[model samples]
Target: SMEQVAMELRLTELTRLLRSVLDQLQDKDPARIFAQPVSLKEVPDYLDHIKHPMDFATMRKRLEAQGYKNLHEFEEDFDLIIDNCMKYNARDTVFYRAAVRLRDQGGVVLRQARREVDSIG
Candidate 1:
C-alpha cells in the first residue's frame, strides 16, 4: 500500500519566530524581516499584541509594562516562553514553496464554444 506524508506547524512556533525577529529589529530591516512567502492569515491566536519598535526606548517601555522585577527576570522568562513556543510552532512553508503556472493575456470567455471552453453548452 502506498501512503502520503503530511506535516503541520503549530501556532506557538509561528509567534516565537515572529517575536525573535521583532526583538532583533535593531540590526535588522523591517522591509525584509519576513522570509519569503510568509502568510498573513496563518497568524496564531493571542499573538496580536506584537508591534514594531519605534525605538529602543519604546521597547524598554513595553518590557517595563510586563511587570518584570528586573531585566534579568524578563530575559529569563522570555527565553523560556519563546523556547516552548518555537518547539510547538515549527512548520514547513510548503504551500508557499509550490510552483505556479501562469497564463498571460487570457481574457474571460462567456461561453466555451471551442476546445478551450471548459463549461459551455
Candidate 2:
C-alpha cells in the first residue's frame, strides 16, 4: 500500500491533492466567477484576450486526464486563472475584484495543500 501510494503520488494521489485545493477555491468563491470558462459568445473575441483560459472545468479536465506532471503544474494553472482574470477585467469590476480575492485566498489554500501533502505522504 505504501508503494502504491508512491506510484499514485506520481499521478493519482497528486490529482486528489490538486483537486482538493481546486475544489476549495471553488467553494470559497461566493460569486462562483471561476465556475467555468467564460463564454466567447457573450464577449466577442474573448478567447483571444485570455491567452490561457483558466477555469475549474479546464483545471478539472487536465487533472482528470492526468495532464499535470507535478504540483507546480497545478499551481501554474491556478495562477493563470488569477492572472488572466486580472488582465481581462479591471480593478473596479466584480470579476476583477473576485479575481483579487481568489489570488489572496488561493495562496492560503496552496499552503494548506503543501501541508497536507507533507503530512500525508
Candidate 3:
C-alpha cells in the first residue's frame, strides 16, 4: 500500500514533468495524429504488426558501463529518429502515426523507470 502510494505520487509528478518536457520538445499527441490519416489501416504492417525494437538493454548496459544512471546522462542520444521521420518523411501517414506513438509510449516507459529508480534511491 505504501509502495503503491509512493508510485502513484511519483507517477503523477512524472506525468507533469513529462507533459512539460513534451511541450518543450513540441511533441504532438499520437492519437490525434493517428486519426488524421485518411485510411483505416493507417499504421503499416511492419510498424503495426511487428513492434519497433528498442535496444534498451544495450542502452542500459552502455550507460552503466559509462557510469551513467539514466537517459539524461547519455550524450548524443538517437532519441529523435522518429521525430525526424515525421518531419522529413511524411509520405506514409501510417508510418508517421506509428512513429509518433512509439516515441510517446517510449518516453512514458523511460520516465517511469527513471522515477522508480530515483524513488528507490
Which one is best on TM-score?
2
- Per-residue lDDT tens digits for candidate 2, residues 1-121, read 8997778666787777787877888887878889788888787788778777888888899989988877788889888888998999888999899988888887888888878877876
Clashing residue pairs, backbone N/CA/C < 3 A, model 3: 42-94
Error of 2 at 48 (Å): 3.4
Q: In model 2, how many backbone clashes occur?
A: 0
Better of 1 and 2 by lDDT: 2
What total of clashing residue pairs does each candidate reach?
A: 1, 0, 1
lDDT by residue (40-109, candidate 1, tens digit) is 3665432353332122333345453443333344334433333333333333532212111000111111
In model 1, the clashing pairs are 13-89
Predictions: Cα RMSD each: 21.9, 2.7, 11.2
Q: Is candidate 1 or candidate 2 better by TM-score?
A: 2
lDDT of 1 at 86: 35
* Candidate 3 structure quality by residue, lDDT tens digits, 5-118: 986665555445444443423234434332222232653443543233222333344443433433364312325345444653475677676666667765665666567556
Ranking by lDDT: 2, 3, 1
Give residue 3's lDDT in candidate 1 (0 to 100).
Answer: 27
